[PDB]
Design a binder for this molecule. Structure first.
Ligand SMILES: [Mg+2]
Length: 244
């Protein structure tokens, strides 16, 4: 199941002068929402999608209309009524809402964000031989979530960090978990950490893998090329995408 947490707020875009939430902005004939979800076009007929939105800007209606139009055959919308502390909480609340709708899903979940485009995405082979994996690229700077490799020739991940550059393998924002239950258990452990371990209040997805790795689960990374991912999460990137 492809899960897209999109309950956040477009604050940088608001300041930049846009009055619509970022995912409704248009570029080259379609909304950023469409550009991002189309990454998974190969799975529209076979895989369920869970869109987790907020009760603002009539987003639930927008998503339902766009998803139907894209031809996504099975999708669910979880509408949240309060802001969350971050994507990890959004995902957890969305999965809880899905269950409240009567849907009993126990399979894998692939978390992705609406700020990223991954044209022609196809699941890598490692997704069939691991408990979870983080898609990564060779990135510049320190403002990414990082995955630390065990050693050359192995795609095993021994640690992840959201702001600490423990490696040069940066997350593309695609986080896969073979079992929904493992995601929820890692989340539960993460929010229950003794207070001394908290460095911030935001709840991001990447750190959750440390809970799984500690429990001995088999977590890997999958390296993609820089040209296979397009980021459109800040105003300047949207402007750049508009020129492309
Ligand atoms: Mg712990």
């Amino acid at each position: 199941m492809i899960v897209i947490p999109m309950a956040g707020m477009s604050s940088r875009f608001f300041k930049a002068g846009y009055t619509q939430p970022k995912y409704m902005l248009e570029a080259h004939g379609q909304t950023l929402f469409e550009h991002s979800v189309n990454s998974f076009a190969a799975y529209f007929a076979s895989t369920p999608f869970l869109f987790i939105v907020r009760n603002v800007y009539d987003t639930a209606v927008f998503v339902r209309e766009k998803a139907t139009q894209l031809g996504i055959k099975q999708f669910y919308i979880a509408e949240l009524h309060t802001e969350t502390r971050g994507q990890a909480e959004t995902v957890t609340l969305g999965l809880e809402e899905l269950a409240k709708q009567g849907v009993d899903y126990q399979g894998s979940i692939t978390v992705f964000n609406i700020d990223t485009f991954r044209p022609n995405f196809v699941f890598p082979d490692i997704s069939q031989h691991s408990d979870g994996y983080l898609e990564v690229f060779q990135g510049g700077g320190d403002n990414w979530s990082f995955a630390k490799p065990e050693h050359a020739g192995s795609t095993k991940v021994i640690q992840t960090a959201e702001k600490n550059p423990i490696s040069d393998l940066c997350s593309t924002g695609l986080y896969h978990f073979n079992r929904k239950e493992d995601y929820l258990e890692a989340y539960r452990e993460y929010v229950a950490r003794p207070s001394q371990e908290w460095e911030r209040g935001e709840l991001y997805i990447a750190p959750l893998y440390n809970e799984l790795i500690q429990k001995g689960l088999n977590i890997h990374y999958h390296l993609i090329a820089r040209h296979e991912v397009i980021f459109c999460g800040v105003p300047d990137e949207y402007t750049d995408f508009l020129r492309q």
